[PDB]
CSV table of C-alpha atoms in Angstrom, one decimal:
chain,number,residue,atom,x,y,z
G,1,UNK,CA,-75.8,-4.8,-178.6
G,2,UNK,CA,-77.9,-6.1,-181.5
G,3,UNK,CA,-80.2,-8.9,-182.3
G,4,UNK,CA,-80.8,-11.7,-184.8
G,5,UNK,CA,-83.6,-11.0,-187.2
G,6,UNK,CA,-83.7,-14.2,-189.2
G,7,UNK,CA,-82.0,-17.6,-189.3
G,8,UNK,CA,-82.6,-19.8,-192.4
G,9,UNK,CA,-81.0,-22.6,-194.4
G,10,UNK,CA,-80.6,-22.9,-198.2
G,11,UNK,CA,-79.9,-26.1,-200.1
G,12,UNK,CA,-77.8,-26.4,-203.3
G,13,UNK,CA,-80.0,-28.7,-205.3
G,14,UNK,CA,-79.0,-31.1,-208.0
G,15,UNK,CA,-81.6,-29.9,-210.6
G,16,UNK,CA,-85.3,-27.7,-207.8
G,17,UNK,CA,-86.0,-30.0,-204.9
G,18,UNK,CA,-83.7,-31.0,-202.0
G,19,UNK,CA,-83.7,-34.7,-203.0
G,20,UNK,CA,-80.5,-36.7,-202.4
G,21,UNK,CA,-79.1,-40.3,-202.5
G,22,UNK,CA,-76.1,-42.3,-201.4
G,23,UNK,CA,-72.7,-40.7,-202.0
G,24,UNK,CA,-74.4,-37.4,-202.9
G,25,UNK,CA,-73.0,-34.2,-201.5
G,26,UNK,CA,-75.5,-32.2,-199.5
G,27,UNK,CA,-74.3,-28.6,-199.5
G,28,UNK,CA,-75.7,-25.1,-199.0
G,29,UNK,CA,-75.5,-21.9,-197.0
G,30,UNK,CA,-76.6,-21.0,-193.5
G,31,UNK,CA,-78.3,-17.6,-193.8
G,32,UNK,CA,-78.1,-15.1,-190.9
G,33,UNK,CA,-79.7,-11.7,-190.9
G,34,UNK,CA,-78.8,-9.3,-188.0
G,35,UNK,CA,-79.6,-5.8,-186.9
G,36,UNK,CA,-77.0,-3.9,-185.0
G,37,UNK,CA,-74.1,-6.0,-183.7
G,38,UNK,CA,-73.9,-9.4,-182.1
G,39,UNK,CA,-71.1,-11.6,-180.7
G,40,UNK,CA,-71.1,-15.3,-181.7
G,41,UNK,CA,-69.5,-18.1,-179.7
G,42,UNK,CA,-70.0,-20.7,-182.4
G,43,UNK,CA,-72.1,-21.7,-185.4
G,44,UNK,CA,-72.4,-25.4,-185.9
G,45,UNK,CA,-74.4,-27.7,-188.2
G,46,UNK,CA,-75.8,-31.1,-187.4
G,47,UNK,CA,-77.0,-33.5,-190.1
G,48,UNK,CA,-79.1,-36.6,-189.1
G,49,UNK,CA,-81.4,-39.2,-190.6
G,50,UNK,CA,-83.4,-41.7,-188.6
G,51,UNK,CA,-86.6,-43.7,-188.3
G,52,UNK,CA,-89.0,-42.2,-185.8
G,53,UNK,CA,-92.1,-43.4,-184.0
G,54,UNK,CA,-94.4,-41.3,-181.8
G,55,UNK,CA,-96.9,-42.7,-179.4
G,56,UNK,CA,-98.8,-41.6,-176.3
G,57,UNK,CA,-100.1,-43.6,-173.4
G,58,UNK,CA,-102.8,-42.5,-170.9
G,59,UNK,CA,-102.2,-42.8,-167.2
G,60,UNK,CA,-104.5,-42.6,-164.2
G,61,UNK,CA,-106.1,-37.1,-161.8
G,62,UNK,CA,-105.1,-38.4,-165.3
G,63,UNK,CA,-102.5,-37.2,-167.8
G,64,UNK,CA,-100.8,-38.2,-171.0
G,65,UNK,CA,-97.3,-39.6,-171.2
G,66,UNK,CA,-95.4,-38.9,-174.5
G,67,UNK,CA,-92.9,-41.3,-176.0
G,68,UNK,CA,-90.6,-41.3,-179.0
G,69,UNK,CA,-88.3,-44.0,-180.4
G,70,UNK,CA,-85.6,-43.4,-183.0
G,71,UNK,CA,-83.1,-45.5,-185.0
G,72,UNK,CA,-80.3,-43.6,-186.5
G,73,UNK,CA,-79.2,-44.2,-190.1
G,74,UNK,CA,-76.9,-41.2,-190.5
G,75,UNK,CA,-75.2,-38.6,-188.4
G,76,UNK,CA,-72.7,-35.8,-189.1
G,77,UNK,CA,-71.5,-32.7,-187.3
G,78,UNK,CA,-69.3,-29.8,-188.4
G,79,UNK,CA,-68.4,-26.3,-187.1
G,80,UNK,CA,-68.8,-23.2,-189.3
G,81,UNK,CA,-67.7,-20.5,-186.8
G,82,UNK,CA,-65.2,-20.6,-184.0
G,83,UNK,CA,-64.3,-23.3,-181.5
G,84,UNK,CA,-65.9,-14.9,-179.8
G,85,UNK,CA,-66.7,-13.6,-183.3
G,86,UNK,CA,-68.4,-10.2,-184.0
G,87,UNK,CA,-71.0,-9.7,-186.7
G,88,UNK,CA,-72.6,-6.4,-187.8
G,89,UNK,CA,-75.9,-5.5,-189.6
G,90,UNK,CA,-76.8,-7.0,-192.9
G,91,UNK,CA,-77.1,-10.5,-194.4
G,92,UNK,CA,-74.4,-13.1,-193.7
G,93,UNK,CA,-73.8,-16.4,-195.5
G,94,UNK,CA,-71.9,-19.4,-194.3
G,95,UNK,CA,-71.4,-22.3,-196.7
G,96,UNK,CA,-71.6,-25.9,-195.5
G,97,UNK,CA,-70.9,-29.2,-197.2
G,98,UNK,CA,-71.0,-32.9,-196.2
G,99,UNK,CA,-71.5,-36.2,-197.9
G,100,UNK,CA,-74.0,-39.1,-197.5
G,101,UNK,CA,-72.6,-42.6,-196.8
G,102,UNK,CA,-72.0,-44.7,-199.9
G,103,UNK,CA,-73.8,-47.5,-198.0
G,104,UNK,CA,-77.5,-47.7,-198.8
G,105,UNK,CA,-79.7,-45.4,-196.7
G,106,UNK,CA,-83.3,-45.6,-195.7
G,107,UNK,CA,-85.8,-43.8,-198.0
G,108,UNK,CA,-87.8,-40.9,-196.6
G,109,UNK,CA,-91.3,-41.8,-195.6
G,110,UNK,CA,-94.3,-40.4,-193.7
G,111,UNK,CA,-96.6,-42.9,-192.0
G,112,UNK,CA,-99.1,-42.1,-189.3
G,113,UNK,CA,-97.1,-43.0,-186.3
G,114,UNK,CA,-93.9,-44.0,-188.1
G,115,UNK,CA,-91.6,-42.1,-190.4
G,116,UNK,CA,-88.1,-41.7,-191.8
G,117,UNK,CA,-86.7,-38.2,-191.9
G,118,UNK,CA,-83.5,-36.5,-192.8
G,119,UNK,CA,-82.6,-32.9,-191.7
G,120,UNK,CA,-79.8,-30.3,-191.4
G,121,UNK,CA,-79.8,-28.4,-188.1
G,122,UNK,CA,-78.1,-25.0,-187.7
G,123,UNK,CA,-77.1,-24.1,-184.2
G,124,UNK,CA,-76.2,-20.6,-183.1
G,125,UNK,CA,-74.3,-20.0,-179.8
G,126,UNK,CA,-74.0,-16.5,-178.3
G,127,UNK,CA,-72.6,-15.2,-175.1
G,128,UNK,CA,-75.4,-14.4,-172.5
G,129,UNK,CA,-78.1,-15.7,-174.8
G,130,UNK,CA,-79.9,-19.1,-175.1
G,131,UNK,CA,-78.9,-21.4,-178.0
G,132,UNK,CA,-81.1,-21.1,-181.1
G,133,UNK,CA,-81.5,-23.9,-183.6
G,134,UNK,CA,-83.2,-24.2,-187.0
G,135,UNK,CA,-84.0,-27.6,-188.5
G,136,UNK,CA,-84.7,-27.9,-192.2
G,137,UNK,CA,-85.7,-31.2,-193.7
G,138,UNK,CA,-84.4,-32.7,-196.9
G,139,UNK,CA,-85.4,-35.9,-198.8
G,140,UNK,CA,-83.3,-39.0,-199.3
G,141,UNK,CA,-84.2,-41.6,-201.9
G,142,UNK,CA,-81.8,-44.3,-203.0
G,143,UNK,CA,-81.0,-44.6,-206.7
G,144,UNK,CA,-81.7,-47.9,-208.5
G,145,UNK,CA,-79.1,-50.7,-208.3
G,146,UNK,CA,-79.0,-53.4,-210.9
G,147,UNK,CA,-76.7,-55.5,-208.6
G,148,UNK,CA,-79.0,-55.8,-205.6
G,149,UNK,CA,-78.6,-59.1,-203.6
G,150,UNK,CA,-81.4,-61.1,-202.1
């Protein structure tokens, strides 16, 4: 058997910053470095954008209950491998490409308990091993429209 050394995600920028807008094609490669030899059930990507709010509330022998509320603006899945596949030592690259809705999207923002975030998640499934995921954030900002209603 072998083992996964590294799992990263590279973005093909439109420049060099991962900033995107409506109708834009977000693409890149899922990078996978491995020592020895591993078997892979599947390699999937999951893109999502949503508004998110964290808050905690104290109870009582006291403890703290954690809450999170999300509103989805965008969601997209795709498979890159399978759905076993064998991979040997060295670097491996797997290209991905999807597109953002031509409908207007929420702009990325970071408040103190509220935020809007977009990310691409890479999910690796292997026989007799727990699923491993890597989530990399990208920024979405709408381009100006001179025909905006009121």
